[PDB]
Amino acid sequence: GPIPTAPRENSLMFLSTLPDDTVPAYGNVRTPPVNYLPGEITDLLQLARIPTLMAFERVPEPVPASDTYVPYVAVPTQFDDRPLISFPITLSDPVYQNTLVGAISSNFANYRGCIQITLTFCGPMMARGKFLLSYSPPNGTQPQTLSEAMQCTYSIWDIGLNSSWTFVVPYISPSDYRETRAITNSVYSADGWFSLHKLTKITLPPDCPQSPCILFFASAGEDYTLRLPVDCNPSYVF
Amino acid sequence: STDNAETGVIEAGNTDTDFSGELAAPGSNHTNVKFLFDRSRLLNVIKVLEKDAVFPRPFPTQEGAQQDDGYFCLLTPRPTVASRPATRFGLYANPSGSGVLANTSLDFNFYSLACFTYFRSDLEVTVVSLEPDLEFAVGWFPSGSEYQASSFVYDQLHVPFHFTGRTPRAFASKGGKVSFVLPWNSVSSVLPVRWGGASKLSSATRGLPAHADWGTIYAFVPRPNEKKSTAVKHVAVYIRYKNARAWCPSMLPFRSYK
Amino acid sequence: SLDFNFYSLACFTYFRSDLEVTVVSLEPDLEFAVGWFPSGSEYQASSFVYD
Amino acid sequence: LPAHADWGTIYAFVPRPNEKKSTAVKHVAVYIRYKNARAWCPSMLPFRSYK
Amino acid sequence: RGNNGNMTFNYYANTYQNSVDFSTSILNPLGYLK
Amino acid sequence: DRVTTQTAGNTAINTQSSLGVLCAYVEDPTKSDPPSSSTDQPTTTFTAIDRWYTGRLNSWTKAVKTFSFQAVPLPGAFLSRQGGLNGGAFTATLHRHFLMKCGWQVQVQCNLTQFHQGALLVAMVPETTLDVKPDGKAKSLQELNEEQWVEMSDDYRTGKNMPFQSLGTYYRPPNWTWGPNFINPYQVTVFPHQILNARTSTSVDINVPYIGETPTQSSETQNSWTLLVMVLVPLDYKEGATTDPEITFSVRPTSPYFNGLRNRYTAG
Amino acid sequence: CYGGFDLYFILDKSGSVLHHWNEIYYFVEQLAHKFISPQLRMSFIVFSTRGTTLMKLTEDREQIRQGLEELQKVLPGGDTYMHEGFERASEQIYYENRQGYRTASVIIALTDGELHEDLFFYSEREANRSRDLGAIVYAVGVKDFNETQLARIADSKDHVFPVNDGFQALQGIIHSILKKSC
């Protein structure tokens, strides 16, 4: 006689995430070889720690050309005591539109860990300035002038023979994992703004042009781990 | 710090690169590419065959043609128009007029993760009828081959050939669902998501890899030809990727502003 | 909504578990489909035409 | 309200295209059973009536 | 790996499960600067 | 330091203020094997062709905009002979072999002064078609000097500028939006690349081994490594500085693989 | 006797109007400021691959003063699908002709000049249906000139203008019927 069985409530259903495999309808086939072409991917995080150029809203001179959005900073000559660039950390903000960690975070739900941003100078070698960059966890208002960005967490930076300064936003948190986008902009999903100030004036000889430029990158650090995917945003196709 | 990024290669920097503090524990591994893709996903819907089928033509087609469109599904993630491999992707937004609307398809959410240039997997075919109380039959032929279409009479009843053949069939239950996994069968080596190239040597549209694909699924009811109803019906098709690999990374689809 | 009979035993302040989702239709002769998205995320809502 | 210390949500839907929808609405229930639970730092109970 | 619970056994032999190749006879970074 | 005298065949190039190298995906890229799909004896390398060919590219001025790029295909550059650059002996060889297979050294060229600024971006993307607007005709050497740069429209960003096909007049004319081949300029530094600017360098190199969809693609149709130069921040210079600097490039094949003799190619 | 004059604009917005966009704008800016007669109908529509209409048929001309200044807002891009433009005109033509008016509609088109085999057929497929209800058809084009295919969408070779004489030639064909307003 057959072995007695009892079918449980889960009959004939198929789960999308169901960790099992199905009988093939045609098998015992071979394939072309693989090994000749290099460059495998085991984890996309080997992918995720590549530099990526951020994207910002253009200063109030809208050029009527297509998509007036700018991957650099135009430092002004004039003395004012407000920062150059200030942007939050919510990984769906319109400053994080096409950064890699923003991009492959945009279809996942939760991450943990640090976020490197670095910045590459571009200007004439006879020009030189001092720039500090500063970060503050969420206060009530936003820290605006130099005392507020002074007390918190910063690094000053020279212009010399090199051209960059690797910076890493530290990872302070109530809970170990954090979200990727804020349905309600709470303390669990934002972590305070980031800014950089000019500390002393850009200094440069005569007959060389004004207003230098600085590019921004954004990359995953070491501890940056992802989890638990979600369905995607098809809005790129429309 | 104080390294410069203009050498093209920079590593990552933990908290003790310039600050005081220690590096954090690794959280999870929902990142490996042969786990990330393994998700049951439908690509489209299918009008069900009920007769001697005919399949669409090559690239130009004048009016007065007789083909039965929207009955096949050339299952790839690549963009497809009228169940034959296209290169772009349509969305017919103002469909009023005459002239038949083509069957478009694309795997929407695959590209939004895809930072690759070459891909490698096996897949599975999951079918489900949307209309109630239905019983059907799915068929298949491999890539680089083509559907057989004729009919041979049995006891005054015209019965087509796609009830039988070599390549496998599958008959469902009373409103059941059919699924099986399906391996590689392609003449080329790895699936391209980007391509240069052309189909033949000269005088060809530059960009469509016509024989680096998977195959197609068609649905049909187990009935003779002369007992066919007037109401048309529909059925969807689902794919889940398996054992995947990947090579030589690339960009992502551009997000709006807008 | 509220889980009625859970509190009448509950002498706790913090809790920890995993759960399971069991669904049942009340109306007869019905066939349906259940969906889900995790916490700290949100439902996707649009439509794309097919034939 | 602890907005992100939760589980998730379940929605039900029929496998049909949008234009073939009936006029009668219908219902479905949802069930939960807890598993592998733990607990910490005890407290009170809901107040019973008198009444 | 992937996602399986098949720590006991599979039903078919693996040559019926998925295609294997021909005979031509702790992770790694992605390209150094020499 | 920083002086790299690279000698091959009989030619020898050095760039005195250079930076280094950049391999891709394998630290030594020149290693390979004869392809497994063939059966004929393959024609391997020979010392008469192990060479830097060089060739002039278009110059660049103030008037350019951000993300505007030039892009040259490969080995299709050798066919149509852009910029005074021909394969010479090499084209006479690979006309006569139906299978071709090779990896590439490139070092590109500029030299700005010390009173300038402005960042280029030398990168070779894999497997693209950035040379055609959808008419079906690949663009050739006459229509390069009318623009000097590709003004980077939205239609490359949304993948609307890839060659589609004749829809056939039985159907409806469509409404296309997307193609899988595109360029996203906020993203283009995921490829082997290095920022070239007037900050530190003058000339700088890439290096890449083979990638392919098959062990060996065809002779005169495939184009794996298009290389594109694009400007991120434009130049500024006062009256008296050297107007409109010039760009050329230097392409080296490494370990060629030929297969299959016939007559010299005549296009049908 | 009938006023019967509802003139309609077709504008390209494809890639080739990159270098010419302000000239096409200046043409429309003068053709709108050719008359101060309010006894007509205006509407602004464009063809990329596909877009939408700009302005509906409106009465008092502060609205087209808004239209002519929002004309700067759109960027030259898209394919050449101008069988959709005649469709977007005709769909509100025939389903806003249930008032019983005799409005002999009239349509002027701004095209680069060349489009291949299938799309030309669908333009003729529209253009039969266009004056099947009684429309009047016109088209111009700045190009290396061909009246070969462009005559088919018109009634004959009379109504497909060059750029050299058509700066005032189409003014005559409007003011030879504008005077008969009743």
XYZ file of C-alpha atoms in Angstrom, chain B:
258
model
C 43.015 61.703 1.965
C 45.313 63.014 0.873
C 45.032 60.827 -2.212
C 43.641 62.142 -5.488
C 40.874 60.508 -7.495
C 42.348 61.365 -10.904
C 44.263 58.051 -10.987
C 40.932 56.360 -11.727
C 41.164 53.924 -8.823
C 40.374 54.911 -5.252
C 39.570 52.529 -2.444
C 37.035 53.031 0.325
C 37.750 54.762 3.613
C 36.495 53.697 7.018
C 35.970 56.017 9.974
C 39.576 55.740 11.134
C 40.924 57.017 7.815
C 40.978 60.483 9.419
C 38.637 60.367 12.449
C 38.564 58.469 15.709
C 36.376 55.378 15.661
C 36.220 51.742 14.602
C 34.696 49.988 11.614
C 31.229 48.456 11.738
C 30.171 44.828 11.389
C 28.904 43.444 8.074
C 25.144 43.207 8.157
C 23.868 40.852 5.490
C 24.493 39.268 2.112
C 21.346 39.924 0.029
C 23.770 41.185 -2.595
C 25.113 38.155 -4.445
C 23.863 38.256 -7.984
C 22.868 34.590 -8.151
C 20.419 35.222 -5.284
C 19.186 38.713 -6.148
C 17.509 37.789 -9.413
C 15.781 34.591 -8.327
C 12.293 36.163 -8.190
C 9.080 35.135 -9.927
C 8.196 37.931 -12.347
C 5.597 38.150 -15.118
C 6.530 39.842 -18.295
C 3.266 39.883 -20.207
C -0.109 38.562 -21.276
C -0.993 36.332 -24.224
C -4.010 35.901 -26.491
C -4.797 32.192 -26.726
C -4.576 30.289 -30.010
C -7.499 28.127 -31.072
C -6.900 27.213 -34.733
C -4.280 26.740 -37.430
C -1.817 29.416 -36.396
C 0.143 31.717 -38.696
C 3.095 33.788 -37.567
C 4.077 37.372 -38.494
C 6.218 38.401 -41.459
C 9.677 39.945 -41.885
C 10.400 43.618 -41.319
C 8.166 45.445 -43.867
C 4.564 44.320 -44.338
C 2.001 45.851 -46.667
C -1.714 45.722 -45.925
C -3.822 42.735 -46.866
C -1.557 40.402 -44.921
C -3.122 37.605 -42.878
C -1.215 36.786 -39.709
C -2.479 36.206 -36.170
C -0.613 38.709 -34.014
C -0.196 38.763 -30.262
C -0.260 34.992 -29.883
C 3.462 34.389 -29.407
C 5.849 35.626 -26.715
C 9.547 35.693 -27.590
C 10.642 35.474 -23.968
C 13.758 37.587 -23.321
C 14.231 40.625 -21.085
C 15.191 42.491 -24.235
C 12.641 44.869 -25.844
C 10.328 43.121 -28.277
C 7.735 44.317 -30.803
C 5.130 42.019 -32.396
C 6.744 38.867 -30.930
C 9.961 39.331 -32.916
C 13.151 40.964 -31.628
C 13.099 44.734 -31.927
C 15.646 47.217 -30.661
C 13.554 49.995 -29.072
C 10.478 49.981 -26.829
C 7.079 51.443 -27.646
C 4.167 52.673 -25.534
C 1.165 53.390 -27.719
C -0.293 56.406 -25.942
C -2.725 57.729 -28.548
C -4.104 54.515 -30.029
C -7.070 55.868 -31.999
C -7.228 55.084 -35.704
C -6.833 52.096 -38.016
C -3.987 49.667 -38.454
C -3.384 47.079 -35.788
C -1.491 47.872 -32.590
C 1.645 45.795 -32.198
C 2.353 43.581 -29.200
C 5.069 45.322 -27.229
C 6.977 43.946 -24.242
C 9.990 44.626 -21.993
C 11.148 43.415 -18.586
C 10.588 46.636 -16.646
C 12.306 46.216 -13.310
C 15.299 44.227 -14.549
C 17.150 47.222 -15.936
C 16.765 49.369 -12.808
C 19.230 47.094 -11.026
C 21.204 46.097 -14.124
C 24.723 47.435 -14.017
C 26.149 44.886 -16.406
C 27.150 44.265 -19.967
C 26.916 40.504 -20.234
C 24.540 38.063 -18.601
C 24.161 34.297 -18.160
C 21.352 32.210 -16.652
C 18.632 29.604 -16.948
C 14.963 30.431 -16.561
C 11.554 28.948 -15.823
C 8.166 29.340 -17.478
C 5.191 29.926 -15.183
C 1.791 30.338 -16.796
C -1.534 31.477 -15.316
C -4.941 32.067 -16.897
C -6.807 35.230 -15.949
C -10.250 34.251 -17.158
C -12.025 31.761 -14.848
C -12.828 28.011 -15.283
C -10.330 27.475 -18.103
C -8.157 24.574 -19.257
C -5.362 25.088 -21.764
C -2.084 23.829 -23.174
C 1.325 25.456 -23.546
C 3.869 24.804 -26.274
C 7.439 25.753 -27.013
C 10.219 25.512 -29.556
C 13.885 26.467 -29.029
C 15.740 29.531 -30.248
C 17.129 29.457 -33.779
C 14.157 27.362 -34.855
C 10.613 28.095 -35.964
C 7.014 26.975 -35.320
C 5.350 24.306 -37.436
C 1.909 25.316 -38.705
C -0.451 22.991 -40.580
C -3.468 20.764 -40.004
C -4.316 17.155 -40.805
C -7.881 15.861 -40.736
C -9.038 13.071 -38.419
C -12.609 11.744 -38.795
C -13.840 14.949 -40.544
C -12.323 17.063 -37.714
C -9.450 19.352 -38.675
C -6.768 19.048 -36.006
C -3.516 21.032 -36.141
C -0.029 19.638 -35.616
C 0.932 21.537 -32.500
C -0.864 18.987 -30.366
C 2.100 16.713 -31.176
C 5.760 16.947 -32.094
C 9.201 16.559 -30.565
C 9.648 19.708 -28.383
C 7.678 19.432 -25.112
C 4.018 20.195 -24.448
C 2.093 20.496 -21.175
C -1.604 20.039 -20.413
C -2.960 21.802 -17.342
C -5.600 20.714 -14.868
C -9.027 22.197 -14.140
C -7.921 25.805 -13.783
C -4.422 24.764 -12.776
C -1.058 26.331 -13.522
C 1.893 24.848 -15.393
C 5.532 25.409 -14.522
C 8.903 23.948 -15.489
C 12.488 25.190 -15.583
C 14.228 25.535 -18.892
C 17.979 25.499 -19.611
C 20.249 27.295 -22.065
C 19.758 26.844 -25.753
C 21.465 29.590 -27.699
C 23.985 29.488 -30.489
C 26.054 32.334 -29.051
C 28.032 32.253 -25.836
C 26.558 34.710 -23.334
C 23.456 36.882 -23.465
C 24.205 40.497 -24.362
C 22.241 43.379 -22.872
C 24.182 45.782 -25.095
C 25.254 45.028 -28.619
C 27.130 46.501 -31.531
C 26.980 44.327 -34.628
C 24.331 43.368 -37.180
C 22.451 40.218 -38.161
C 24.081 39.555 -41.514
C 27.292 40.851 -43.038
C 25.914 43.929 -44.797
C 22.614 45.787 -45.323
C 21.208 45.063 -41.878
C 19.791 47.101 -39.010
C 22.675 47.658 -36.609
C 21.930 46.512 -33.089
C 19.642 43.515 -32.702
C 21.228 40.204 -31.635
C 18.727 37.962 -33.399
C 20.045 34.595 -32.184
C 21.038 35.362 -28.572
C 17.661 34.778 -26.961
C 15.664 32.027 -25.264
C 12.500 30.963 -27.095
C 8.719 31.488 -26.992
C 5.572 30.137 -25.337
C 2.175 29.894 -27.010
C -1.109 28.822 -25.435
C -3.916 26.851 -27.045
C -6.988 24.920 -25.925
C -7.279 21.152 -26.469
C -10.189 21.309 -28.920
C -10.738 20.601 -32.634
C -10.808 23.548 -34.990
C -14.506 23.643 -35.835
C -15.738 23.913 -32.230
C -14.274 27.331 -31.434
C -16.056 29.992 -29.374
C -16.589 33.608 -30.375
C -15.269 35.138 -27.149
C -11.499 35.595 -27.072
C -9.551 34.998 -23.852
C -6.199 35.752 -22.251
C -3.351 34.240 -20.230
C -0.187 35.653 -18.660
C 3.424 34.476 -18.624
C 5.981 34.640 -15.779
C 9.762 34.164 -15.635
C 12.143 33.617 -12.723
C 15.898 33.671 -13.385
C 18.246 30.986 -12.074
C 21.954 30.317 -11.402
C 22.904 33.656 -12.883
C 26.336 35.112 -13.567
C 27.368 38.566 -14.846
C 30.276 40.376 -16.495
C 32.008 43.769 -17.010
C 29.826 46.395 -15.339
C 28.037 49.403 -16.803
C 25.468 52.160 -16.228
C 21.847 52.351 -15.074
C 18.667 53.745 -16.682
C 18.376 57.481 -16.357
C 15.984 58.688 -13.678
C 13.608 61.588 -14.229
C 13.818 65.126 -12.884
C 11.472 66.090 -14.778
